[PDB]
Amino acid sequence: RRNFSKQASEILNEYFYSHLSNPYPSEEAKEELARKCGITVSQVSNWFGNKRIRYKKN
């Protein structure tokens, strides 16, 4: 398992911090970032799931 490309982590962070009042990317905006970042929509889901909870925990 790898730790993501920086550009991919560039994108994910960008998104999350932008829409912070509702950090829940529409089901289609998931393929957008999954395409942008190169990862899977699944990995995007994991990311926001992880980011979201670890975010309140810090």
Added chain:
Amino acid sequence: FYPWMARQTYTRYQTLELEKEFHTNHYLTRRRRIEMAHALSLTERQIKIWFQNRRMKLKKEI
């Protein structure tokens, strides 16, 4: 400020037993779950949910 801002792990034997069963059938009748439940010291609800998750896990292979 934002609103959106604010579990037990099963044993090796329990998982194996659930995996086996799933391997025979993806869906479990209420009687079958009541059985399995007593068989593994888990609830009927826990068995139900374990199978719901296992299906969503298998589906995540499409």
Added chain:
DNA sequence: ACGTGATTTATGGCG
């Protein structure tokens, strides 16, 4: 070891 991506138990409510 540890950070971070992934997986496992549980819930709610929608269809």
Added chain:
DNA sequence: GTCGCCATAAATCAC
């Protein structure tokens, strides 16, 4: 009604 799906929350697991 009656039942599974499915997006998430949280806790763990594990490269």
